[PDB]
Design a binder for this molecule. Structure first.
Ligand code: BCL
Ligand code: BCL
Ligand code: BCL
Ligand code: BCL
Ligand code: BCL
Ligand code: BCL
Ligand code: BCL
Ligand SMILES: CC[C@H]1c2cc3[nH]c4c(c3C)C(=O)[C@H](C(=O)OC)c4c3nc(cc4[nH]c(cc(n2)[C@@H]1C)c(C(C)=O)c4C)[C@@H](C)[C@@H]3CCC(=O)OC/C=C(\C)CCC[C@H](C)CCC[C@H](C)CCCC(C)C
Ligand SMILES: CC[C@H]1c2cc3[nH]c4c(c3C)C(=O)[C@H](C(=O)OC)c4c3nc(cc4[nH]c(cc(n2)[C@@H]1C)c(C(C)=O)c4C)[C@@H](C)[C@@H]3CCC(=O)OC/C=C(\C)CCC[C@H](C)CCC[C@H](C)CCCC(C)C
Ligand SMILES: COC(C)(C)C/C=C/C(C)=C/C=C/C(C)=C/C=C/C(C)=C\C=C\C=C(C)\C=C\C=C(/C)CC/C=C(\C)CCC=C(C)C
Ligand SMILES: [Fe+2]
Lengths: 250, 281, 304, 42, 48, 42, 48, 42, 42, 42, 48, 48, 42, 48, 42
C-alpha cells in the first residue's frame, strides 16, 4: 500500500480493545456495591455489560451471569468505620460468624455433574476402581495440626477420573461425624502428616459434609475456605507460634 | 470503591510487626505497608525520565538517556547523567519491584490465597537484575549495562549485539527460546480452552471436562488435564529468563568473543577429528 | 503389581474411560493406549485415544515428506558416513531456487532442488492440521476459537514463502531449510532492510510476544494458587461463581488495579494470541512491498 | 446501575475535561502561526 | 451498628457534622484562595 | 448522597489536585521565555 | 460495641482536643514555619 | 470526626511531606546550571 | 504512642538517614567535574 | 451426519465469496490491463 | 413446550409477515439509495 | 423427538418449504447478478 | 461402515473442488504470452 | 437414537435411497457440465 | 470393518486423485523436452 496508512486502522480499531476486553472481564463481580448493600460509587470507565443468555452443562436453569449479586448469605462484620475505607471486625470469634479470611457462599442444591449421569467427587468406598492387593499399602495413617499435636486419622481417598486426581483427605474421627479439608496446603514427609493451618482442637468446626460420598457445590465453599480462615489471624502472639507460623521455606 | 461480594473480605492485618498503621484502601488499589512505599517509589521515578532531559539532551522519552557508568572507573561511581544519576534510578526501579511483589503478602496473609505469586515476579526480579547487578561489578566497572529508554536501548541490542558474532549460536539463549515461543504455544489453546462451551456456536448445551477429553485427546495425543496446563503456563513464562540469565552469566564476562565461534567445539572429536565432511568439507 | 498411595498429592488412576460421543467416530480410534504410571501423581497419566482419521494423518504424511526431503538433503555432503551426519546434523544446508530463478519449477535436484518437495507436502500438513484443531471442536459441540488463534498463526506462514515471493517472484524470497541455515536468515531480514527496530509492525509482534509471559507467568501461578479452594476446575467457576473468583478476583484489583471474569481471563489470553503472528503477518507483509530499509522508514514516519 | 454519579466528578471528570484539553493544546501551541505563549517580544 | 440499603452510608449526622466540615477545606483553600495566588501571576508575566 | 470522605480527604484526594498542580509547575520552567525565575544569570 | 450518633469514634470531648491539637496545629507548626524558612529560600537563588 | 488521631495523624505528615518535599528537591537538582553545588561546573 | 518509637524510629529511621545518605553518594561523589580522589593519574 | 451444516451457511459461507474475491480483487485491481478506476487518462 | 424443528421459531408464517415484508421490501433502501451514491462514482472519475 | 432417517430433521414441512421456496428465488440470482459484473468487464476494457 | 454420509455432502461439493482448482488454476497465467484475457488486446 | 456397531446411522436400506437418488443423479452433472466445459480446453488452445 | 467402506473410496479416493497425481504434475510441466505447451515459436 503505502508508508503511512496501515498504522491508523490500528490506532483506532484496537485503541478500544482494552476497552472492549475489560468489560468482558468485568461481567462477574460488578456492579460495585458499598459496605452494606447499596448502589455504590460507580463501576469505572469500562462499565459492566448487560449479560447474554447462558446455557448450563446439565440443565441447571437460566442462570444468566453476572447473576445473583445481592445479600443472600449471612455476613457478620461489626462496622468499625461507618465511612467507606477503613476495615471491619467480626462479632465474637471470627471463625464462627464466618467473616474475614474464611469465605463461603449459598448455592443451589445440585452438585457438580459430569456427563456419565453421576457426580464428580467420590471416596474410594464409592469407586471400586483401584484397590490394595500387593505388599504393604499406606491408606491409613495418623496426622498433626498446626498446634503441633495429633489431629485424627486419614484412611481413605476421594478418587478422580477425568483428571485422575484427588480433592480431599477424609478423616475418621473417634465418632464418625463427617469433616473435610483441602489438598494443596498439605506437606507430608515420612510416616506422620503435618498440617500448618488449623490447630488440632478446631477441626470439628469444619462442617460435616451432608453426605460422606457427595459434595454439593453449595458445600464446597466453606469446606475449602476454613483453612484460609486460619491463614490470616493465626496466631497472636507470643512463643511457640512465632517459631511455627513464621520462617519456614516451602 | 469496592465490589458487591467485597463485603466479608474486608479485615485489617496482613502486615507484620507494628500494627495496621499502613493498610488503608485508597480506592480500587491496595496501599499496605509496601503500598505507600511504592507511592514513594513511583513519584520519584517519573522525574527520572525528565532529569537527563536537560543534561543529555531531548525532553521526550524517545531519546531521553541516563547512561550507565564507564567500564573502568572501578568499584565506585561515575559522572552523572552518564552514570552517577543512572546509579540512582536502579534502587528505585528494583526498590519498587520489591515493594510490589511483597505488598502482595499483606494480601496473601490477609486472606489465604497461596504464596506462589511473590515468586512469578521474582523471575522478573531475577531477569532485570542480570542486566544491572549480575554483570558489571566484576569485568571492570558499572559500564557494562543497558540504557533505560524505549528507543535508546534499541540501537543497543542489534547493531550493537553482534559482539559475539550471532547470538543464535548461543545454545541456552536458543533453549531459552526453545522455552519462549512455547509460552504462547500453550496460552493459545488454554486461553481458548475456556471459551466455547456456553458459547459453542449459539444455543447448545455447555461442555464439561469430558468433552475436553474428546477435543484435546482429539488434538495432540497428550491430555494432562486442566491442571496440567496451568502447570503449562507457569512453564512457559518464567524460565525463558533463567536460560537467558545463564546465556549471559557466561557471555561477555567470560565470553566477550564470537559465540559463532562456539560451534567449532562440536566438530572436534577424536572419531571425526581430522575429517572435513559436509559443508565444512 | 499394585499401584501405591504415597504421601501428599494425591492420585488415583483410571480404568477404561475416554470422553464423549456425538459427531466423532467409533471404529477409528485405536486400542486403549498404555498408561505411563511412573510417579504420575502430579498431573495426569493416560495415553490415547486419538482421532486417527484422514483429517490428521494427512499431516503425519505431508509432514514426513517435509521431514525426509530436507532429510535427503542433509546426508548429501557428509561423505556417506554416519559419522558426519550427526556431526553436522545442523551444519548441513539447503536453499530454494536462486534469487534469480523464481516462478519456474524447472530446477533439478542439485543447486536448489529438494526445497520444492518438503513444503509442497507440508502445505497439506499445516493446512491439514489447521483443521485437526478446528473440526475436532465440532465433533462434540464446542467452538472454533482453537484454530482462529491458528489462522492468525498461519498468517505469518502466509507471507514468508507464500504471498510475497510470488507477487514479487522468487524462491530465495522464501526461507532456507535446516537447523541453522534459517538462523543465518532471521538476521538477514534484519540488516538488508536497514534494521527492523523502526519497523513497529515486526516490533509490535515482538510486543505481542512480550505479552504472552505478562499473561501466563501469573495464570500458571494463581490458578495453581487458588486451587486449594476450587479454581483448578475451570469448567465450574464462571456461571456458578465459586470462591476462586474471590481469592483471585479480589487479589489483582487491589494489586495492579483491575480484575477479570473467569471467562474473560481467556478473552485477553486469546487477544495476546490472534495478534502475535497476525501483527507479524502484516508487519511482514508490510516489509517487502512497502519500505525495505526500515531505518529509512522510522525517521520519515517517526521523527520527521 | 449502568451509570452512577457521586465518584466520577471528584477524581475522574477533573481529569477527563483535562484529558480532553491536553491532546488539543500541544498542536495549537505549536502550529506554524498560532502558539500564543512564547512569542511576545518581537 | 451496621447498615443494609441505599444509600447509607452515609448518613446523618455523620454526613452533616463531618462531610460538610472537611470538603470545603479542599474546595476553598484551592477555589478562591487559589485566586489569591493568581495575584503575583495575572500580571507576572503574561504581559512582557 | 453516598460517597466517602473520612478516608479519602486525608491521603487520597490530596493527590488529585497534586496530580493537577505540580504536573505543570515543571512546564512553566521548560520554556525559554516564561520561566519566571530560571533565566537569571543572563 | 459500636454506638450510634455523631460520630464515633471518637470521641467527645475530642473535636477540639484531638482534631484541633494535632490537626489544626499543622496549619501552624509548618505552614508558618514555611513563611520564616522561605525568607532564606525564596532569594536563593532565583536571582543571579 | 472518624479518620484517625492516635494512629494516622502523625504519619500522614511525616513520609507524606518526604513524599512531597525531599523528592521535590530532585527537581531543583535536575538543573546542573543553577544548583547549589553545580554553579561552578558551568 | 502518637508516633511509634521502637518501630518507626529505631530501625526505620536508621535507614531513613540511610535513605538520604547513599543516593546522594551517587551525585556528589559523582559529578563530571569534581572527584578529588579518583584522578590521581591524570 | 459427521460434520456441520448450520455453521457453514452463515459464517463459513464467506470463505467462498469474500476471502475468495477480496484477495483476488487487489490482484486485478493492480493490473494495468484492466484499470477501470485507474483508467481516467493514460 | 419447546418448538418442533428448524427453524421454529420461526414460525409459520411469522416468517412471511415480519421477516418477508420489511426484510425484502424495506431492505430495498439498501438497493435503491446505494445507486444514488454509485451513479456519482461509476466512472467519475475513472474517466477524467 | 429424535427421528430415524434423513433428513428429519429435516423436516419435509421444513425441508422443501424452507430450502426450495427461495431456490429459484435464491439460487437463481447469484448466478445472474454476478454475470452483470462480468458482462460489464469482458468488454471494458481488456481490449487494447 | 465407520462413517455417515448426509452432511459432509455439501462441503465435499461446495468448496472441495476449489482446493484442487485454486492450486491448479494459477500455474498457467504466469506466462506473459498466454493469458487469454490479457493478450486479446494489442 | 443409535442401534449398535457397524454401522448406524446409516442405513439399510436407505443408503441407496440417499446416495443414488441425488448422489448419482445430481452429482453426474459433475460430469455432464464439466465435461461440457472440457471442450473449450481439450484443443483450445493446446493445439492452435 | 475398520477398512473405511463408504468413506475411503468416497473421500480418501477423491483426494488420492490429488495425493498421487499432482505431486508429479509440477515437474514434467516445465520440462523442455516434452513441453507440449511450452514450445512457443521456437
Ligand atoms: C543480536 C540479536 C540477537 C538477540 C539480542 C539479545 C540481547 C542483547 C539480549 C537478548 C536477550 C534474550 N534473548 Mg535475544 N536476541 C535475538 C533475538 C531473540 C529472539 C527472536 C525470536 O528473535 C528471542 C525469542 C530472543 C530471546 C532471548 C532470551 C534468551 C533473552 C531474554 C532475557 C530477558 O528478556 O529476561 C529479562 C526479563 C525482564 C527484564 C523482565 C523483568 C520485569 C521487571 C522486574 C518489571 C519491569 C517493570 C517496568 C519497568 C514497568 C513498565 C510497565 C509500566 C508500568 C507500564 N532473542 C538475536 C538472536 N537478546 C537478553 C539476555 O539474554 O540476557 C538476560 C539480552 O540482553
Ligand atoms: C535485528 C534484530 C531485530 C529482530 C529481527 C527479526 C527478523 C528478521 C524477524 C523477526 C521476527 C520477530 N521477532 Mg524479532 N528482532 C528483534 C527483537 C526480537 C526479540 C527480543 C530481543 O526481545 C524477540 C523475542 C524477537 C522475536 C520476534 C517475533 C516477535 C517475531 C516473529 C514471531 C515468530 O517467530 O513467529 C514464527 C511462527 C510462525 C512462522 C508460525 C509457525 C506455525 C507453523 C505454520 C506450523 C507448522 C505446522 C507443522 C506441520 C507442525 C509440525 C509439528 C510436529 C507435530 C512436531 N525479536 C530485533 C529488534 N525479528 C520475524 C517477524 O515475522 O517479524 C514480525 C522476523 O522475520
Ligand atoms: C532484553 C533486551 C532489550 C530489550 C528488548 C525489547 C524488545 C524487542 C521490545 C522491547 C520493548 C519494551 N521494553 Mg525492552 N529491552 C530491554 C530492556 C527492558 C527492561 C529492563 C529495564 O530490563 C524492561 C522493563 C523492558 C520492557 C520494555 C518496555 C519499555 C517496552 C515494551 C514492553 C512490551 O510491550 O511488553 C510487555 C510489557 C508491558 C505491556 C509493560 C509496558 C512497558 C512500557 C512501554 C514502559 C513504561 C514506561 C513509561 C513510558 C514511563 C511512564 C512513567 C510516567 C507515567 C511518566 N525492556 C533490553 C535492553 N524490549 C517493546 C517495545 O518496542 O516497546 C514499545 C519491544 O518490542
Ligand atoms: C486567548 C487564548 C487564551 C486561552 C483560550 C481558551 C479557551 C476558549 C478555553 C480555554 C480553556 C482553558 N484554558 Mg486557556 N487559553 C490560553 C491558553 C492556555 C494555556 C497556555 C498553554 O498558555 C493554558 C495552560 C491554558 C489553560 C486552560 C485550561 C485551564 C482550560 C481548559 C479546561 C480544561 O481543563 O478541560 N490556556 C490563552 C491565554 N482557553 C477552556 C476553558 O475551560 O474555558 C476557560 C476553553 O474553552
Ligand atoms: C504564566 C502563567 C500561566 C499559567 C500556568 C499555570 C501553572 C504552572 C499552574 C497553573 C494552575 C492554574 N491555572 Mg494557570 N496559567 C495561566 C493562565 C490560565 C488560564 C487562562 C489562559 O485563562 C486557565 C484556564 C488556567 C488554569 C489554571 C487553574 C486551573 C489553576 C489555578 C487554580 C487552581 O489552583 O486549581 N491558567 C497563565 C497562562 N497555571 C495550577 C494548576 O493547574 O493546579 C491545579 C498550576 O500549577
Ligand atoms: C474483473 C473480473 C474478472 C473476474 C474476477 C472475479 C472475482 C473477484 C470473482 C469472480 C467470481 C466469478 N467468476 Mg470471475 N472474473 C473474470 C472472469 C471469469 C472467468 C473467465 C475469464 O472465463 C471465469 C471462468 C470466472 C469465474 C467466475 C464465476 C465462478 C464467479 C461468478 C459466479 C459465481 O459466483 O460462482 N470469472 C474477470 C476476468 N471473478 C466470484 C467468485 O468466484 O466467488 C463467489 C468472485 O468473487
Ligand atoms: C500428453 C500428456 C497429457 C497427460 C498425461 C496423463 C496420463 C497418462 C494420465 C493422466 C492423468 C490425469 N491427468 Mg493428465 N496429462 C497431461 C498433464 C496434465 C495436467 C497439466 C498440469 O497440464 C493436468 C492438470 C492433468 C490432469 C490429469 C488428472 C485429472 C489425471 C490424474 C488422475 C487422478 O485424478 O489421480 N494432466 C498432459 C496434457 N495424464 C491420469 C488419469 O487417470 O487420467 C484420467 C493418467 O494416467
Ligand atoms: C519471566 C518473568 C516475566 C514476567 C512476570 C511478571 N511480570 C509482572 C508480574 C509477573 C508475575 C506481576 O505480578 C506484575 C504485574 O502487575 O502483572 C502484569 C508484573 C509487571 N511487569 C511489568 C512490566 C514488564 N514485565 C516484563 C517481563 C516479565 N514479567 C517476564 C517475561 C517486561 C518486559 C517486556 O521485559 C515488562 C515491561 C509491570 C507492568 C508489572 C510490575 C508492577 C510493579 O512492580 O510496579 C512497581 C513500579 C513502580 C512502583 C514504579 C517505580 C519505578 C521508577 C519510578 C521508575 C522505574 C525506572 C525504569 C527504568 C522504568 C523504565 C521502564 C521501561 C522504559 C523499560
Ligand atoms: C499465537 C501465536 C502462537 C502460536 C499459536 C498456535 N500454535 C498452534 C496452534 C495455535 C493456535 C495450533 O492450533 C496448533 C496445535 O495443535 O497446538 C498443539 C499449533 C502448533 N504449533 C506448534 C509449534 C509452534 N508454535 C509456535 C508459536 C506460536 N504458535 C505462538 C507462540 C511456533 C513458532 C514460534 O514458529 C511453532 C513452530 C505445534 C506444536 C502445533 C502445530 C501442529 C501441527 O501442525 O503438526 C501437524 C502434525 C505433524 C506434522 C505430524 C508429523 C510429525 C513429523 C513432521 C514427522 C516425523 C515424526 C514421525 C513420528 C516419524 C516417526 C514414524 C512413526 C510413524 C513411527
Ligand atoms: C535420521 O534422519 C532421517 C532419516 C529420519 C531423516 C531426517 C531428516 C531431517 C534432518 C529432518 C529435519 C527437520 C527439521 C528440524 C526441519 C526444521 C525446519 C525449521 C527449523 C523451520 C522450517 C520452517 C518452515 C518453512 C521455512 C516453510 C516455508 C514454506 C512456506 C511458508 C510455504 C511453502 C509453499 C510452497 C513451496 C508452495 C507449494 C504449494 C503449492 C500449491 C504449489
Ligand atoms: Fe485457562
Amino acid at each position: 500500500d503505502l508508508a503511512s496508512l496501515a498504522i491508523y486502522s490500528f490506532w483506532i480499531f484496537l485503541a478500544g480493545l482494552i476497552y472492549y476486553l475489560q468489560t468482558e472481564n468485568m461481567r462477574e463481580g460488578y456492579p460495585l456495591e458499598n459496605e452494606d448493600g447499596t448502589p455504590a460509587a460507580n463501576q469505572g470507565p469500562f462499565p459492566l455489560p448487560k449479560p447474554k443468555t447462558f446455557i448450563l452443562p446439565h440443565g441447571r436453569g437460566t442462570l444468566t451471569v453476572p447473576g445473583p449479586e445481592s445479600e443472600d448469605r449471612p455476613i457478620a462484620l461489626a462496622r468499625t468505620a461507618v465511612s467507606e475505607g477503613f476495615p471491619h471486625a467480626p462479632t465474637g470469634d471470627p471463625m464462627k460468624d464466618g467473616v474475614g479470611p474464611a469465605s463461603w457462599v449459598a448455592r443451589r442444591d445440585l452438585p457438580e455433574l459430569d456427563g456419565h449421569g453421576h457426580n464428580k467427587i467420590k471416596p474410594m468406598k464409592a469407586a471400586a476402581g483401584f484397590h490394595v492387593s500387593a505388599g504393604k499399602n499406606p491408606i491409613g495413617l495418623p496426622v498433626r495440626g498446626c498446634d503441633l499435636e495429633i489431629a485424627g486419622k486419614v484412611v481413605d481417598i476421594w478418587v478422580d477420573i477425568p483428571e485422575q486426581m484427588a480433592r480431599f483427605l477424609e478423616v475418621e474421627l473417634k465418632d464418625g461425624s463427617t469433616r473435610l479439608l483441602p489438598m494443596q496446603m498439605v506437606k507430608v514427609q515420612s510416616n506422620r502428616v503435618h498440617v500448618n493451618a488449623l490447630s488440632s482442637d478446631l477441626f470439628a468446626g469444619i462442617p460435616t459434609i451432608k453426605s460422606p460420598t457427595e459434595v454439593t457445590l453449595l458445600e464446597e465453599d466453606k469446606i475449602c475456605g476454613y483453612v484460609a480462615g486460619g491463614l490470616m489471624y493465626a496466631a497472636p502472639k507470643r512463643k511457640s507460634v512465632v517459631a511455627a507460623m513464621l520462617a519456614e521455606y516451602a | 470503591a469496592l465490589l458487591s461480594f467485597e463485603r466479608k473480605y474486608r479485615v485489617p492485618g496482613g502486615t507484620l510487626v507494628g500494627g495496621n498503621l499502613f493498610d488503608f484502601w485508597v480506592g480500587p488499589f491496595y496501599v499496605g505497608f509496601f503500598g505507600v512505599a511504592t507511592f514513594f517509589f513511583a513519584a520519584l521515578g517519573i522525574i527520572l525520565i525528565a532529569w537527563s532531559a536537560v543534561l543529555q539532551g531531548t525532553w521526550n522519552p524517545q531519546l531521553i538517556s541516563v547512561y550507565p557508568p564507564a567500564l573502568e572507573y572501578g568499584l565506585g561511581g561515575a559522572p552523572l547523567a552518564k552514570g552517577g544519576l543512572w546509579q540512582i534510578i536502579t534502587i528505585c526501579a528494583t526498590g519498587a519491584f520489591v515493594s510490589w511483589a511483597l505488598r502482595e503478602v499483606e494480601i496473601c496473609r490477609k486472606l489465604g490465597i497461596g504464596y506462589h505469586i511473590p515468586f512469578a515476579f521474582a523471575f522478573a526480579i531475577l531477569a532485570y537484575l542480570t542486566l544491572v547487578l549480575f554483570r558489571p561489578v566484576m569485568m571492570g566497572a558499572w559500564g557494562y549495562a543497558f540504557p533505560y529508554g524505549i528507543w535508546t536501548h534499541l540501537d543497543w541490542v542489534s547493531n550493537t549485539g553482534y559482539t559475539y558474532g550471532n547470538f543464535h549460536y548461543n545454545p541456552a539463549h536458543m533453549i531459552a527460546i526453545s522455552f519462549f515461543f512455547t509460552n504462547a504455544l500453550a496460552l493459545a489453546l488454554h486461553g481458548a480452552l475456556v471459551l466455547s462451551a456456553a458459547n459453542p456456536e449459539k444455543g447448545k448445551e455447555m461442555r464439561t471436562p469430558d468433552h475436553e477429553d474428546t477435543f484435546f485427546r482429539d488434538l495432540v495425543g497428550y491430555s494432562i488435564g486442566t491442571l496440567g496446563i496451568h502447570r503449562l503456563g507457569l512453564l512457559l513464562s518464567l524460565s525463558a529468563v533463567f536460560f537467558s540469565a545463564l546465556c549471559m552469566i557466561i557471555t561477555g564476562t567470560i565470553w566477550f568473543d564470537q559465540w559463532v565461534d562456539w560451534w567449532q567445539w562440536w566438530v572436534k572429536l577424536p572419531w571425526w577429528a581430522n575429517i572435513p565432511g559436509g559443508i565444512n568439507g | 503389581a499394585e499401584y501405591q498411595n504415597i504421601f501428599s498429592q494425591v492420585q488415583v488412576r483410571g480404568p477404561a474411560d475416554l470422553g464423549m460421543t456425538e459427531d466423532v467416530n467409533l471404529a477409528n480410534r485405536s486400542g486403549v493406549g498404555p498408561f505411563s504410571t511412573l510417579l504420575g501423581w502430579f498431573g495426569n497419566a493416560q495415553l490415547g485415544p486419538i482421532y486417527l482419521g484422514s483429517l490428521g494423518v494427512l499431516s503425519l504424511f505431508s509432514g514426513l515428506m517435509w521431514f525426509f526431503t530436507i532429510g535427503i538433503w542433509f546426508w548429501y555432503q557428509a561423505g556417506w558416513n554416519p559419522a558426519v551426519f550427526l556431526r553436522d546434523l545442523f551444519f548441513f544446508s539447503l536453499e530454494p531456487p536462486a534469487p534469480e530463478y523464481g516462478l519456474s519449477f524447472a530446477a533439478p535436484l542439485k543447486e536448489g532442488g529438494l526445497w520444492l518437495i518438503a513444503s509442497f507436502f507440508m502445505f497439506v500438513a499445516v493446512w491439514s492440521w489447521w483443521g485437526r484443531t478446528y473440526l475436532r471442536a465440532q465433533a462434540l459441540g464446542m467452538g472454533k476459537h482453537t484454530a482462529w488463534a491458528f489462522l492468525s498463526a498461519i498468517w505469518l506462514w502466509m507471507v514468508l514463502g507464500f504471498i510475497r515471493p510470488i507477487l514479487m517472484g522468487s524462491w530465495s524470497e522464501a526461507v532456507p531449510y535446516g537447523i541453522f541455515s534459517h538462523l543465518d536468515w532471521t538476521n538477514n531480514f534484519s540488516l538488508v532492510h536497514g534494521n527492523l527496530f523502526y519497523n513497529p509492525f515486526h516490533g509490535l509482534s515482538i510486543a505481542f510476544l512480550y505479552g504472552s509471559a505478562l499473561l501466563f507467568a501469573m495464570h500458571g501461578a494463581t490458578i495453581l494458587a487458588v486451587s486449594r479452594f476450587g479454581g483448578e476446575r475451570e469448567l465450574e467457576q464462571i456461571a456458578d461463581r465459586g470462591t476462586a473468583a474471590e481469592r483471585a478476583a479480589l487479589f489483582w484489583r487491589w494489586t495492579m488495579g483491575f480484575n477479570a471474569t473467569m471467562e474473560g481471563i481467556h478473552r485477553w489470553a486469546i487477544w495476546m494470541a490472534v495478534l502475535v503472528t497476525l501483527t507479524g503477518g502484516i508487519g511482514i507483509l508490510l516489509s517487502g512491498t512497502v519500505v525495505d530499509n526500515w531505518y529509512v522508514w522510522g525517521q520519515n514516519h517517526g521523527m520527521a | 446501575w449502568m451509570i452512577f454519579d457521586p465518584r466520577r466528578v471528584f477524581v475522574a471528570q477533573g481529569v477527563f475535561l483535562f484529558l480532553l484539553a491536553v491532546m488539543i493544546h500541544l498542536i495549537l501551541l505549536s502550529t506554524p502561526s498560532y502558539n500564543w505563549l512564547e512569542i511576545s517580544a518581537a | 451498628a451496621d447498615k443494609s440499603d441505599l444509600g447509607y452510608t452515609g448518613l446523618t449526622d455523620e454526613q452533616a457534622q463531618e462531610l460538610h466540615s472537611v470538603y470545603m477545606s479542599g474546595l476553598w483553600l484551592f477555589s478562591a484562595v487559589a485566586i489569591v495566588a493568581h495575584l503575583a501571576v495575572y500580571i507576572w508575566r503574561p504581559w512582557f
